[PDB]
């Protein structure tokens, strides 16, 4: 829930005017910040394993998601000149 | 250990009681098996400690005996139990079983 | 839990033939694997056991230097060398595999050798 | 005439030899010469302040009941199980702080009488001895902890204790430590303890410890040798950007606290102020 | 129970086997019941195995009337009456026998004399580590075993000349061993003033699995380092944004290093995990110092900074990889 | 000589993932015939007995060969068992407490599904 919280709330980031570039571009650092802080707490009381767990391939693809969530406004300013 | 079977054929009709002795050389007084091997096939166990029955044989063989002399036997001989009978002891090292009874 | 043997053997005298037993149903290292002699005209004989793991051996007494044990992990097969054959090693070749005991309740079908 | 005859001579039924007495009851006090090798001497804690060190405590003394003339051997090493039935030193460690013998597969014990009476005794131990620590210059610090080898029981007209002339504190070969590089120079002198009870023999050996300062260096320093120097680069944006020069102070400025924060992992809470703190709070200026 | 009573009586356990005779010869083998985890805090790693000892005792020759199978197994108590070889192992921290319903002990008394004991053990050995290329490294932890009173004039220990260990299936965590060197039987220490001493080691080799840090270390540092590089195609003018998406980059980057760290020994020398956080700490804190080049050009065309600073940290990093991993793995 | 053995755990808990392993405390019981045990003397089918007579008669040396730390429980007196049925049958309870080690296989670990074993093996004696 926590880490859903999280990639549900970078997306409002397109429900921002364009040129509030330290809006979107603080949302989407800030977002990214508690991603790794969630992440890194994932595994806490895991003992260090090789292969891939079933929360380690979520946490990551939230982590993906939410950094191409920021990802995507350096594509728009890139555009939106 | 010298497992002995002093009868190499025995005769018998299908649905007699027939017993096969076993004389061991000393004394283990449990350590007997008893294994079936038709013409062609491996050797398949009976009975080991001489009383006990394998997975899945059928309940009409019986060990008793101990001590030296022991002794198979077949209540109900049906069709299937016209084959080689072997004793073993699995008590030492060098296990004999004692030749064969027919 | 199930032993699979190599083929039939025809072997010429002072030779030297190996079998193998292809343990199919649990790693070789695990149980003791047995190797017995079936002589026509005689009965059966035991000829030794080996852990497959720890290469551990127990000979007979009367096969001392006439059989040798080995294995290997990387197929999970034990082996049996028989070495100066002699027209007396004319006989089948079993690897049994007593678990809960000194018995033979695992069977292989069997390696005809005739020298 | 017989190996358990000699033994059942010399102590056990027909010896008359008595563990309760010391050697030379009532005459000159029974010395002491004790020797030790440290195995594994590290593991050395600072939010506890004590080390862990595995030694053999050699002591070496004459019972002058022990003497035989039966086996033409200059010593003869006893079964690891007869020293039970002899006389023993009863010294303990003064800052032990834990210890216990180990007992694997047999107790590690050893005995070698000599012909002439001289008993050896080694036994291996595993001690926590707790020394204090001076952290008024902490990452560059050099410590200095010792282990004091005291009598209990005995005054010094009973018991007395020495060290071995020549090498008496030895170490292993390829004995590493990490944080840590063991000084082969190490003080022996003679603490004597004063109780209440009377005077009680002691002998400490002084380890000087002076500290690999690599792990600080990567970890402390330069984290904050970095965060300082990154809030230089504000001096160059533009003035007008308020909110961007703004955010840049005040990430460095907390991140700092952060850091001086973090740097008292396994420290223990000390009064005085330490030489990476005054680092920190001089950085977080 | 004469069988056993004969026996003992007139032996004595004080006097080891041939007594002023040649020293005794212990044949030592190992069953490597678990292998636990190395702890790179502590640098032990706790095991659990089956020490085997095989020696001979002349006065335990079974009399001429006793047929048996081969050896005559026992009642595992009666270890207290016989001798036995004093080995301590001189890498444990702490180790432990074990009595979870009574002492677990073999003893087997063969018809020569020759006599098994196979104790059970837990140990926690020390091994020191080698942290350099810390994730892509590979140890070697020791197990030295080796006799306490009696020189080697008296006891002598030697490895099975089979399979002295025994492992068959440990699977650690993040390690593994497959086949090493069970090697110096010669490592007989000598002390001054007691003698020498048996000595039989044998020394582990541990692989680490850097999967665990391939997704925990080096997968979110690598798209921290990349969220830097965000800053260079965002307008220049706006500074409340190029600032912030860079001091990101250092202060994840400084967090990780410490958070890394903390459960690991604390070695004075750069490891291989430490060059690579070092290294993206650097690169993000240098497209934070590539904007204030910029910011100052504006005070007086700085676009083509950052053009040719868009296609040259990719590059400038790639080529941190190419070196990094090459050397390392 | 064998032992028909049965377990009551009393109660699981600390199943470390990073440790490995778990805790429990059983009454290992476990019942075997000793024909030198057999008595015409008293009329009952069972008898119980002091804990204390529990020190000088044969008992199996089985143990756990997971077990990774375990100890007996001294608590104001040895908690052992003792009933020496009037044929030879002995029972034999004592309450142990396991620090069991199962490997965890963690693929799917928010929401896997794990398989513990507990071996009871003898040591000292052989198969026969
Ligand atoms: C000690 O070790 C021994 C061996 O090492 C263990 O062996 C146990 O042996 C018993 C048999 O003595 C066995 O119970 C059998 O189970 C079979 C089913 O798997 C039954 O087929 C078998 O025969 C009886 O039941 C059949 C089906 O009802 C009948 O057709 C058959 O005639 C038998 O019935 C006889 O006995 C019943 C009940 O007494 C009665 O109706 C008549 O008297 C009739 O004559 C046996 O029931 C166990 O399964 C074996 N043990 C295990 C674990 O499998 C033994 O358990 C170990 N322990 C002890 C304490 O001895
Ligand atoms: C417990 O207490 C006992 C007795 O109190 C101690 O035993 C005595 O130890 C002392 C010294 O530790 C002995 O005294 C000296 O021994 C020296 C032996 O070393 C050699 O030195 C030279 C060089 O090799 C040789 O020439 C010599 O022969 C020795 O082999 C001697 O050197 C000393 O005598 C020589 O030096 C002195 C001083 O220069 C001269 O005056 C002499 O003429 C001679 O040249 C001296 O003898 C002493 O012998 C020991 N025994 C006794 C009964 O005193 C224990 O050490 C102590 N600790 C224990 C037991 O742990
Ligand atoms: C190698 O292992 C052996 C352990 O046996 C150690 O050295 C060997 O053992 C002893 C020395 O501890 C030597 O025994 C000697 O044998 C000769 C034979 O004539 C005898 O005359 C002597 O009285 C003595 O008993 C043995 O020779 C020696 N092996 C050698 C010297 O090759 C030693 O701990 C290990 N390391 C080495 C030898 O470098
Ligand atoms: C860590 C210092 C990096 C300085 C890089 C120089 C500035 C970038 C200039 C690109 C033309
Ligand atoms: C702190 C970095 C300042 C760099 C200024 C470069 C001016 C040419
Ligand atoms: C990686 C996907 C980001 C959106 C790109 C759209 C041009
Ligand atoms: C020792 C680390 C050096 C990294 C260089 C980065 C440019
Ligand atoms: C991620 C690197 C993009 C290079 C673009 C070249 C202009
Ligand atoms: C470990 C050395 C790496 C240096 C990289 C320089 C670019
Ligand atoms: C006692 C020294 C204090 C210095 C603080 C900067
Ligand atoms: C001694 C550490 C050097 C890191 C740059
Ligand atoms: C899974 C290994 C990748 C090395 C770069
Ligand atoms: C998991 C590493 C992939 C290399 C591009």
Same mark, same amino acid.
């Not at chain 4, 590290?42 to 405590?57: C, H, P, Q």
């Not at chain 4, 022990?66 to 010593?75: I, R, T, V």
């Not at chain 5, 087997?108 to 104790?119: A, E, K, N, P, Y």
């Given at each position: 829930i926590?880490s ?11 429900w921002?005017?364009?040129?509030a ?12 910040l508690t991603?790794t802080?969630?992440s890194?707490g994932?595994?806490?009381?895991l ?6 767990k ?8 939230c982590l993906?998601?939410?950094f ?5 406004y350096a594509?728009?300013?890139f555009?939106?000149? | 250990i010298?497992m002995?079977?002093?009868?190499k ?5 299908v649905g ?7 004389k ?9 098996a008893?294994y ?5 096939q491996?050797?398949?166990l009976?009975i ?6 394998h ?6 063989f019986?060990?008793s005996?101990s001590?030296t002399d022991y ?8 069709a ?5 009978y ?5 008590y030492?090292?060098?296990r004999?079983?004692?030749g064969?009874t027919? | ?6 083929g039939?053997?025809?072997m ?5 033939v190996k079998?193998s ?8 290292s ?7 002699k ?8 035991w000829?030794?056991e080996?852990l ?5 051996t ?9 059989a ?11 082996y049996?060398?028989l070495?100066?054959?002699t027209?007396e ?9 007593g678990?809960?005991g ?6 292989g079908?069997?390696?005809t050798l005739?020298? | 005439?017989?190996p358990?005859?000699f033994?059942?001579?010399l102590?056990?039924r027909?010896?008359?030899?008595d563990?309760r007495?010391?050697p030379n009851?009532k005459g000159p006090?029974?010395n002491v010469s004790?020797n030790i090798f440290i195995?594994s001497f590290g ?10 060190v595995?030694i053999?405590?050699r002591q070496?003394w ?9 086996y ?9 199980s007869?020293?039970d039935s ?7 460690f003064?800052?032990?702080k834990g210890?216990h %013998?180990?007992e $694997?597969?047999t107790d590690?014990? @050893?005995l !070698?009488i ?5 008993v050896?005794?080694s +036994?291996?131990i595993?001690?926590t001895?707790a020394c ?8 560059m610090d050099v410590?200095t ?15 007395i ?10 170490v292993?070969?390829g ?13 022996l ?7 209440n009870?009377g005077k %009680?023999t002691? $002998?400490?050996?002084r380890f000087? @410890?002076? !500290?690999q300062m690599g792990?600080?260096?990567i970890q402390?320093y +330069?984290?904050?040798?970095?965060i300082?120097?990154l809030?230089?680069?504000?001096f160059?944006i533009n003035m007008?950007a308020?909110?961007?020069?703004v955010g840049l102070?005040?990430?460095?400025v907390?991140t700092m606290?952060?850091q001086?924060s ?5 420290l ?8 990476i703190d005054?680092?920190?709070?001089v950085?977080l200026? | 129970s004469?069988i056993?009573?004969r026996?003992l009586?007139s032996?004595?356990?004080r006097?080891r086997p041939?007594?002023?005779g ?7 083998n ?5 292998f ?5 805090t502590?640098?032990?790693?706790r095991?659990?195995?089956f020490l085997?000892?095989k020696?001979?005792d002349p006065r ?6 006793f047929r048996?199978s081969?050896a005559?197994?026992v009642?595992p108590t009666?270890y207290?009456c016989?001798?036995?070889p004093?080995?301590?192992?001189a890498?444990?921290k702490?180790?432990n026998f ?5 002492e ?5 008394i063969?018809?020569?004399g020759?006599?098994?004991?196979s104790?059970?053990?837990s ?5 020191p ?14 197990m ?11 006891l002598?220990?030697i490895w099975q000349?089979?399979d002295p260990?025994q492992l068959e299936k ?9 086949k ?5 039987g010669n490592?007989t220490?000598?002390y001054?003033?007691?003698g ?6 044998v ?12 997704m925990?270390?080096?997968?979110p540092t690598?798209?921290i ?10 307008n220049?003018?706006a500074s ?5 998406l860079?001091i ?11 958070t890394?760290?903390?459960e690991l020994?604390?070695?004075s ?6 060059v690579?956080?070092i ?5 993000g804190f240098?497209?934070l110092?590539e ?5 100052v050009?504006?005070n007086?065309?700085?676009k083509?900074?950052?053009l040719?600073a ?5 590059f400038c990093?790639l080529?941190f990889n190419?070196?990094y991993?090459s050397?390392?793995?």
């Amino acid at each position: 829930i926590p880490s859903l919280l999280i990639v549900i709330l970078s997306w409002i980031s397109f429900w921002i005017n364009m040129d509030a570039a330290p809006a979107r571009v603080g949302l989407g650092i800030t977002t990214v910040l508690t991603m790794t802080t969630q992440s890194s707490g994932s595994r806490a009381s895991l003992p260090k394993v090789s292969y891939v767990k079933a929360i380690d391939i979520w946490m990551a693809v939230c982590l993906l998601f939410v950094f191409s969530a920021l990802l995507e406004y350096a594509a728009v300013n890139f555009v939106s000149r | 250990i010298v497992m002995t079977q002093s009868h190499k054929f025995m005769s018998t009709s299908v649905g007699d009681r027939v017993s096969i002795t076993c004389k061991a050389s000393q004394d283990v007084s449990t350590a007997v098996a008893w294994y079936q091997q038709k013409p062609g096939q491996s050797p398949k166990l009976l009975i080991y400690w001489a009383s006990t029955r394998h997975t899945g044989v059928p309940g009409r063989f019986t060990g008793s005996g101990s001590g030296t002399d022991y002794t198979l036997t077949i209540s109900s001989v049906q069709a299937e139990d016209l084959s080689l009978y072997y004793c073993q002891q699995h008590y030492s090292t060098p296990r004999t079983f004692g030749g064969g009874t027919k | 839990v199930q032993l699979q043997q190599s083929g039939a053997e025809l072997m010429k005298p002072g030779a030297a033939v190996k079998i193998s037993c292809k343990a199919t149903g649990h790693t070789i290292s695990r149980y003791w694997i047995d190797w017995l002699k079936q002589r026509p005209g005689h009965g059966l004989e035991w000829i030794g056991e080996i852990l497959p793991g720890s290469g551990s051996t127990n000979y007979n007494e009367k096969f001392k230097g006439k059989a040798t044990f080995t294995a290997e992990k990387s197929s999970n097969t034990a082996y049996m060398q028989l070495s100066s054959l002699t027209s007396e090693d004319s006989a089948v070749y079993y690897c049994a595999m007593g678990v809960r005991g000194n018995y033979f309740d695992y069977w292989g079908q069997g390696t005809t050798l005739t020298v | 005439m017989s190996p358990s005859d000699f033994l059942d001579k010399l102590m056990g039924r027909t010896s008359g030899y008595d563990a309760r007495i010391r050697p030379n009851f009532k005459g000159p006090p029974v010395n002491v010469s004790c020797n030790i090798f440290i195995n594994s001497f590290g593991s050395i804690a600072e939010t506890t302040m004590d080390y862990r060190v595995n030694i053999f405590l050699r002591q070496q003394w004459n019972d002058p009941r022990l003497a035989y003339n039966e086996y033409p051997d200059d010593s003869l090493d006893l079964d690891p199980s007869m020293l039970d039935s002899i006389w023993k030193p009863d010294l303990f460690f003064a800052n032990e702080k834990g210890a216990h %013998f180990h007992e $694997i597969t047999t107790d590690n014990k @050893l005995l !070698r009488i000599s012909r002439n009476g001289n008993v050896l005794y080694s +036994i291996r131990i595993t001690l926590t001895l707790a020394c204090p620590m001076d952290l008024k210059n902490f990452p560059m610090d050099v410590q200095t902890c010792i282990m004091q080898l005291e009598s209990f029981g005995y005054t010094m007209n009973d018991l007395i204790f020495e060290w071995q002339e020549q090498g008496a504190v030895q170490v292993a070969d390829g004995l590493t430590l990490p944080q840590f590089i063991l000084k082969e120079e190490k003080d022996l002198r003679y603490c004597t303890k004063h109780y209440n009870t009377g005077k %009680f023999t002691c $002998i400490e050996a002084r380890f000087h @410890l002076e !500290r690999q300062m690599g792990y600080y260096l990567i970890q402390m320093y +330069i984290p904050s040798l970095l965060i300082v120097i990154l809030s230089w680069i504000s001096f160059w944006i533009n003035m007008d950007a308020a909110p961007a020069r703004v955010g840049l102070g005040i990430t460095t400025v907390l991140t700092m606290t952060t850091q001086s924060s973090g740097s008292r992992a396994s420290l223990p809470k000390v009064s005085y102020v330490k030489a990476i703190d005054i680092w920190m709070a001089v950085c977080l200026l | 129970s004469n069988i056993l009573n004969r026996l003992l009586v007139s032996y004595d356990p004080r006097i080891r086997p041939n007594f002023k005779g040649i020293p005794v010869d212990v044949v030592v083998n190992i069953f490597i019941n678990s292998f636990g985890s190395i702890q790179e805090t502590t640098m032990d790693y706790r095991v659990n195995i089956f020490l085997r000892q095989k020696w001979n005792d002349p006065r335990l020759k079974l009399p001429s009337d006793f047929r048996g199978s081969d050896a005559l197994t026992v009642d595992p108590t009666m270890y207290k009456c016989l001798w036995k070889p004093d080995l301590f192992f001189a890498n444990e921290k702490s180790a432990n026998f074990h009595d979870v319903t009574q002492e677990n002990i073999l003893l087997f008394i063969f018809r020569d004399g020759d006599v098994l004991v196979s104790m059970r053990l837990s140990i926690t050995l020390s091994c020191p580590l080698d942290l350099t290329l810390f994730p892509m490294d590979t140890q070697r932890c020791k197990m030295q075993l080796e006799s306490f009173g009696y020189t080697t004039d008296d006891l002598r220990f030697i490895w099975q000349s089979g399979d002295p260990v025994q492992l068959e299936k440990i699977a650690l965590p993040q390690f593994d061993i497959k086949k090493e060197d069970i090697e110096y039987g010669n490592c007989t220490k000598y002390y001054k003033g007691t003698g020498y001493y048996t000595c039989v080691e044998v020394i582990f080799t541990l692989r680490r699995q850097v999967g665990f840090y391939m997704m925990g270390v080096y997968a979110p540092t690598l798209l921290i380092v990349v969220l830097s590089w965000l800053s260079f195609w965002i307008n220049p003018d706006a500074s409340a944004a190029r600032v912030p998406l860079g001091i990101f980059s250092v202060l994840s980057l400084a967090s990780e290093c410490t958070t890394l760290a903390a459960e690991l020994p604390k070695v004075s020398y750069v490891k291989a995990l430490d060059v690579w956080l070092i290294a993206c700490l650097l690169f993000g804190f240098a497209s934070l110092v590539e904007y204030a080049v910029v910011q100052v050009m504006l005070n007086n065309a700085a676009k083509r900074i950052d053009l040719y600073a868009r296609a040259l940290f990719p590059f400038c990093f790639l080529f941190f990889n190419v070196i990094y991993w090459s050397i390392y793995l």
